[PDB]
């Protein structure tokens, strides 16, 4: 994995030694070169994971998250270069440094062979995210949002530290490859109950779990566009990655510990989606949609059937692409009206037709239109949870109604109807913005041709 970590670190001299007008073009070019290089991780086998060293390996779960992560950096650089154009050159280089450093932490978070190194990188991802939100966020509430984002994650994860060090003392190792073969069944006790909670609640917060999700409609909304892209597209999916790693060590206790949390998700996706029907802030509507979509990933990991893991990792990759594009579309209208009120700018298909078509495609992938990998993940999770209990389809199916309802209302409020009269600074769509939308949507639609690469280690 050292053929990826070293170019990501060489992106630091590539942004701090660049000419003052070349610091976006060079970082975009070489980050796209790293993203083209990321395809070598697709050397996956049906039996063995691509095991590099004592420190790094990459199975078919971590590989699509890595390719999405290394792809997301050029898209964040294209997204965040317009509103940081009047910024000081040193703070501009510091912003690019925080994005590069966050990618650097993420690519060795997903390839951590050992779990306490996973913890160190997993909590290392807080600090560039916290600095990006609380420094380049636009409104007043970025400080409070950074506080909530920091202290939900740390309060969930400092018991995870004690739990992982307890596994290191008990089993002898926190290598995942060793613990595939030295896993002991976890019996029923209160000690093993709080063992389970300490191993799970950090990732429950990072997914987020319903009831614990209060950081997210502040952290995703008060962030800048690159912060919202990396928080929605990757940093939620650390929780699903970590749960899929750590429920190896939590059997058969998960079979009766998952019962409340599944309820919290199966009801939570009914609530948060319903919250999306009454959100006046468009960016908050996309945030609660992200909560509603990650509730299915929580359910699928907690029922721990193969169809559920295949659908959950397909839903993670698909929601990363779709939610990143929806935040970028909301930014494309925020850079024209300078407000996030959804009812303010209306009728935008009369003025911006191709950008309305990008809104249309992002809304159709949001509502899981087949054969998108959104629908492949959604459908496979629904199959596995019908196998879990035959009544859950009601909570699934009603969700698939409400998920349609706000996905098109967002399309009807913003793009359709009569245009707002007094708003006259609606510029034509830049080539940069349509490039951003196309680089989100075209990989998402190409993955419908060959979806087996985003279906996880048990395809």
């Amino acid at each position: 994995m050292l053929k990826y970590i070293i170019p990501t670190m060489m992106l630091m001299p590539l942004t701090w030694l660049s000419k003052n007008s070349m610091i976006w073009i060079n970082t975009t070019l070489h980050s796209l070169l790293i993203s083209l290089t990321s395809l070598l991780l697709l050397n996956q086998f049906g039996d063995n994971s691509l095991n590099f060293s004592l420190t790094f390996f990459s199975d078919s779960l971590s590989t699509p998250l890595l390719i999405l992560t290394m792809w997301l950096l050029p898209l964040m650089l294209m997204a965040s270069q317009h509103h940081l154009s009047k910024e000081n050159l040193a703070r501009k280089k510091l912003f690019i440094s925080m994005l590069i450093l966050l990618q650097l932490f993420l690519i060795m978070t997903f390839t951590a062979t050992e779990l306490i190194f996973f913890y160190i990188m997993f909590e290392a991802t807080l600090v560039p995210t916290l600095i990006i939100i609380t420094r380049w966020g636009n409104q007043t509430e970025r400080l409070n949002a950074g506080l909530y984002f920091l202290f939900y994650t740390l309060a969930g994860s400092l018991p995870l530290l004690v739990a992982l060090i307890y596994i290191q003392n008990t089993m002898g190792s926190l290598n995942f490859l060793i613990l595939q073969y030295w896993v002991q069944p976890m019996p029923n006790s209160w000690s093993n109950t709080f063992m389970w909670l300490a191993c799970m609640m950090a990732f429950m917060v990072k997914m987020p779990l319903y009831g614990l999700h209060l950081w997210l409609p502040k952290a995703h909304v008060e962030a800048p566009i690159a912060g919202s892209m990396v928080l929605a597209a990757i940093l939620l999916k650390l929780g699903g990655y970590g749960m899929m790693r750590i429920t190896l060590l939590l059997n058969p206790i998960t079979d009766f510990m998952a019962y409340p949390f599944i309820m919290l998700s199966l009801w939570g996706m009914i609530m948060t989606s319903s919250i999306c029907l009454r959100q006046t802030d468009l960016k908050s509507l996309i945030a609660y949609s992200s909560v509603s979509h990650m509730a299915l990933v929580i359910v699928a990991i907690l029922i721990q059937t193969p169809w559920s893991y295949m659908g959950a990792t397909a839903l993670m990759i698909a929601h990363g692409l779709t939610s990143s594009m929806l935040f970028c579309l909301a930014n494309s209208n925020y850079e024209r009206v300078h407000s996030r009120t959804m009812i303010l700018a209306r009728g935008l298909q009369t003025l911006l037709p191709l950008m309305a078509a990008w809104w249309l495609l992002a809304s159709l992938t949001n509502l899981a239109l087949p054969p998108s990998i959104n629908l492949i993940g959604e459908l496979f999770v629904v199959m596995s949870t019908f196998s879990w209990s035959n009544i859950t389809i009601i909570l699934m199916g009603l969700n698939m109604v409400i998920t349609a309802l706000y996905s098109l209302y967002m399309l009807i409020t913003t793009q359709r109807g009569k245009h707002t009269h007094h708003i006259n600074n609606i510029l034509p769509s830049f080539t940069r913005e349509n490039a951003l939308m196309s680089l989100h949507m075209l990989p998402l639609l190409l993955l419908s041709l060959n979806p087996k690469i985003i279906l996880g280690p048990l395809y």
């Binding site: 298909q349 009369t350 003025l351 109807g417 009569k418 245009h419 510029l427």
Partner: protein, 177 residues
């Protein structure tokens, strides 16, 4: 109720609006033109019966029970004109009513496609921006203290002035673009 100039509906205006709505809902009930013609003259006779009532209390009472009469006897799906609010073609072409300022954001390769149109548009924008300060100082010298009482706007007073707040009435899009 809700009018831009008047703060209310007078009794005479309420009687006229009830008369128009009664004839329209009756015509919805009375599809054919001769049958509607007969019953519309009968309804005109009913309106011309109590025409000369001088007691405003008694007249308001008669208007109120006539509204009760109408609400009991209205068509459930009345006739609506196509471009009328509730019709089948109402606000249909609002997706083609592009505002004028979008023409300011064209590329020069498509502005040069219409040279006379934009060369004629520049003097519209010129006339607008040199009429603007005169009509603003017209509005702030004629409006009473405490704000304008009604939503009515004054006309132009001089020979050379344009009427105040005129641009989004003159340069509104056509109803069939």
């Amino acid at each position: 109720a809700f009018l831009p100039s008047a703060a209310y509906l007078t009794h005479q205006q309420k009687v006229l609006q009830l008369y128009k709505r009664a004839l329209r809902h009756l015509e919805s009930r009375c599809v054919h033109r001769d049958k509607y013609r007969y019953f519309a003259c009968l309804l005109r006779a009913r309106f011309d019966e109590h025409k000369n009532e001088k007691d405003m209390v008694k007249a308001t009472q008669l208007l109120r029970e006539a509204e009760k009469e109408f609400w009991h006897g209205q068509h459930p799906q009345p006739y609506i004109f196509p471009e009328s609010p509730g019709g089948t073609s109402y606000e249909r072409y609002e997706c083609y009513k592009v505002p004028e300022w979008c023409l300011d954001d064209w590329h020069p390769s498509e502005k040069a496609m219409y040279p006379d149109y934009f060369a004629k548009r520049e003097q519209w924008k010129k006339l607008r921006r040199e009429s603007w300060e005169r009509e603003v100082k017209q509005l702030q010298e004629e409006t009473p203290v405490g704000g304008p009482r009604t939503e009515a706007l004054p006309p132009a007073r001089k020979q050379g002035d344009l009427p105040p707040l005129w641009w989004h009435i003159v340069t509104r899009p056509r109803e069939r673009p």
